[PDB]
From a paper:
Brachyury is a transcription factor that plays an essential role in tumour growth of the rare bone cancer chordoma and is implicated in other solid tumours. Brachyury (encoded by the TBXT gene, also formerly known as T) is the founding member of the family and was first identified in 19275. The DNA binding domain forms an immunoglobulin-like fold and contacts DNA via an unusual insertion of an α-helix into the minor groove. All T-box proteins recognize a common consensus sequence named the T-box binding element (AGGTGTGAAA) with family member-specific variations found in the preferences for repeats, orientations (inverted or tandem), and spacing of such repeats.
We have also obtained a crystal structure of WT brachyury (at 2.7 Å resolution) in complex with a single T-box binding element half-site oligo which allows us to directly compare binding interfaces and DNA distortions between single and palindromic sites. Contacts to the DNA are made via loops between strands A and B, c and c’, and two α-helices following on from strand G at the C-terminal end of the DNA binding domain.
Author numbering: 41 to 221
The structure:
DNA sequence: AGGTGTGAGCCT
DNA sequence: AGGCTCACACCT
């Protein structure tokens, strides 16, 4: 049937172990790693749209204390619900199935910025969630799919240097800093 | 054009 | 210190 698997899920888990962190900024920040998924079991000729949002992973604020993540408290008023529609939407199942669906251009921010942006609240842990929707009649239908490997804490600066190291290692745009010699 | 971390600078 | 921001020199 409909199956949706995470591409490069293992890079996500490598980050998860160390407690993953995603920078947000005022102008909005791209994710690394990028969320990419494989889809199967769609109707090749049906029309679907893909949506992405972020759900709170627990109720505590967090803080980094001497090389370790520890909870804080007082979860600031939950962030406004935002969503990002994949720019290829709407499109045929064939298109969504022919190659991994990658959310490379979504931008995460800490301000009520608009235009394909998701506002997160800093020092909170969030989980990406992907949705598939089909408008029709009997085939009317929305799925949601979570990937615990991709949980992360929003931050305005990296805190675990080991995370920064992995970011620099794999994100091509930080390749200039990977001059590790 | 457009994304990346690093320092530096800022307020509390 | 502790969190947020902005120029910048790199990269794509």
């Amino acid at each position: 049937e409909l199956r949706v698997g995470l591409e490069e899920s293992e890079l996500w888990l490598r980050f998860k172990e160390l407690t993953n962190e995603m920078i947000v900024t005022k102008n909005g920040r791209r994710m690394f790693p990028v969320l990419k998924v494989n889809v199967s079991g769609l109707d090749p000729n049906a029309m679907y749209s893909f949506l992405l949002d972020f759900v709170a992973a627990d109720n505590h604020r967090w803080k980094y204390v001497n090389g370790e993540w520890v909870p804080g408290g007082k979860p600031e008023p939950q962030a406004p619900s935002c969503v990002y529609i994949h720019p290829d939407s709407p499109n045929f199942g064939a298109h969504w199935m022919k190659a991994p669906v990658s959310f490379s251009k979504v931008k995460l921010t800490n301000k009520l910025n608009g235009g394909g942006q998701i506002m997160l609240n800093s020092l909170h842990k969030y989980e990406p969630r992907i949705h598939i929707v089909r408008v029709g009649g009997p085939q009317r239908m929305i799925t949601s799919h979570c990937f615990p490997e991709t949980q992360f804490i929003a931050v305005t600066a990296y805190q675990n240097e080991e995370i920064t190291a992995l970011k620099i290692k794999y994100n091509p745009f930080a390749k200039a800093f990977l001059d590790a010699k």
